[PDB]
């Protein structure tokens, strides 16, 4: 066979979880088959067929989204979590069925040790359920799973040949020249 027509190893991405920005991509050497010294002609074709059978990025995106859906740890509460978040807000604060005395006497009230308005459970849950005041995510930073949905591992044949894309190791393009920078 011809190695120029052989499928290249995919570029896997580095997430950099703390900053949240992409840490770049690398040649996926961590999962490679040893096939030229021991394998020869019988295994060169096999390794090529394995490499070109690497899923296209859309398929990998679908697989990763399906894997993430079965987590049980989605960012927002599912029926299991929201049922108990409703249950504890229901049993929080002054009880609704507690018949207590309201004494509007400007002399000689009762002690009322206990243990005339009340808040409804709808608003009580509304306080607990509402999100931040931002309601929009800052650009650049992404969580692990939203980074996995985008930025997918893919075979990139002939990458360093085009007009002016090169690659994204760690940079910030400024002057129309790809300035891999932040040194």
């Amino acid at each position: 066979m011809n190695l120029l027509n052989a499928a290249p190893t995919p570029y896997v991405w580095k997430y950099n979880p703390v900053t949240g920005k992409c840490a770049g991509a690398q040649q996926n050497y961590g999962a490679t088959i040893d096939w030229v010294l021991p394998g020869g002609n019988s295994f060169a074709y096999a390794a090529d067929e394995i490499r070109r059978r690497f899923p296209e990025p859309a398929v990998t995106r679908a697989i990763t989204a399906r894997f993430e859906a079965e987590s049980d740890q989605q960012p927002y509460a599912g029926p299991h979590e929201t049922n108990i978040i409703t249950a504890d807000v229901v049993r929080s604060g002054p009880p609704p069925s507690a018949v207590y005395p309201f004494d509007p006497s400007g002399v000689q009230r009762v002690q009322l040790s206990g243990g005339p308005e009340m808040t409804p459970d709808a608003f009580k849950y509304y306080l607990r359920v509402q999100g931040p005041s931002q309601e929009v995510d800052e650009p650049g930073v992404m969580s692990q799973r939203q980074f996995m949905t985008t930025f997918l591992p893919a075979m990139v044949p002939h990458p360093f040949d085009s007009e002016s894309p090169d690659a994204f190791p760690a940079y910030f393009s400024s002057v129309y020249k790809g300035t891999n920078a932040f040194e």
Partner: protein, 346 residues
């Protein structure tokens, strides 16, 4: 004065008691010429014989002077004190409804819990403590239950929950430096430094520093001011220089930022000085002086100036950066016999 500048009193003998006992410090008179009325008679000059001696271990320590007199004039004190919680995660935590159990263990080491103005071994001096009752006081706002449940419910919401940081914001590493040694190398494993704030460093005497994370330090026989625990730093001098190399050979400044680009020359001797590199009428360097003023006061490129807005801080630069200068006779000359002896006959 340090023990090396003292002598016995003709009835006292060394090795009979530890050098960290009270009657050892009492029965060792200092040399009378190492400091006296003629010691640099016209110079505002900290005694170089005690520049490395803890100044907070002094009977003029007004803070400890007040702290000791709050317990009484006797050594038999029925103390009743209120100690704040200081762990950053729970220092200002605002607990909501529920049942919480919160246990904590209190030191019984006299050297740890008590501070002497002399730094003697309190365990060897018969000091001890007994805790009779330790109760936990809590104040609760009597706010309306119709609103505190609302308040607790807007605090149970995950988008708005408490976040607490340690004010120091510094990992603490103690690197041993023996007596005769003058250099120290701090190598660290490979790391990402993902949000590092910078470096802070002084040197603390190992005799005044307890074992870290120790239930009870047995080699700690000192009861003065632990400079590690409090801010009682007094050895910010005795740093000739320092260098940073993030990789094996990559200096962090590494852009000819400093006048000595490969090192943070904190101070250099003015006697050997030829090119300058000494600022504020002392031996601190131009490079290091800019580093300190830029860090604390945020304006060095617009001009050096004093910053009264941070004098209260008690831990900034300008309030306690004290340069001094003396002249001294030049001995090792035909005259000028240096008639003051600093070595006792022991």
């Amino acid at each position: 004065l340090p023990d090396r500048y003292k002598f016995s009193i003709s009835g006292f003998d060394a090795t009979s008691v530890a050098p960290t006992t009270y009657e050892y410090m009492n029965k060792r008179v200092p040399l009378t010429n190492v400091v006296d009325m003629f010691t640099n008679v016209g110079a505002r000059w900290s005694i170089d014989q005690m520049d490395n001696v803890n100044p907070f271990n002094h009977h003029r320590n007004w803070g400890l002077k007040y702290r000791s007199q709050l317990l009484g004039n006797s050594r038999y004190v029925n103390f009743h004190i209120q100690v704040p919680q200081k762990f950053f995660a729970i220092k200002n935590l605002l607990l909501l409804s529920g049942s919480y159990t919160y246990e904590w263990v209190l030191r019984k080491d006299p050297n740890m819990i008590l501070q002497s103005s002399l730094g003697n071994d309190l365990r060897a001096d018969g000091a001890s403590i007994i805790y009779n009752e330790v109760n936990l006081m809590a104040n609760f706002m009597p706010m309306d239950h119709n609103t505190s449940n609302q308040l607790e419910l807007m605090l149970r919401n995950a988008t708005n929950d408490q976040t607490f940081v340690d004010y120091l914001g510094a990992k603490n590493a103690l690197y041993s430096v023996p007596a005769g040694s003058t250099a120290l190398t701090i190598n660290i494993p490979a790391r990402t430094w993902e949000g590092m704030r910078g470096w802070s460093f002084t040197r603390i005497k190992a005799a005044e520093t307890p074992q870290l994370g120790a239930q009870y330090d047995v080699n700690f026989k000192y009861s003065g001011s632990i400079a590690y625990s409090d801010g009682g730093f007094y050895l910010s001098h005795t740093f000739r220089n320092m260098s940073i190399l993030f990789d094996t050979s990559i200096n962090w400044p590494g852009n000819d930022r400093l006048l000595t680009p490969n090192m943070f020359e904190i101070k250099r001797s003015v006697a050997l000085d030829t090119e300058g590199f000494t600022m504020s009428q002392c031996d601190i360097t131009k490079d290091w002086y800019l580093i300190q003023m830029a860090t604390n006061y945020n304006f060095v490129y617009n001009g050096y100036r004093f910053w009264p807005d941070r004098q209260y801080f008690h831990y900034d630069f300008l309030r306690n950066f004290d340069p001094m200068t003396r002249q001294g006779p030049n001995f090792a000359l035909p005259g000028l016999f240096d008639l003051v002896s600093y070595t006792p006959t022991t």
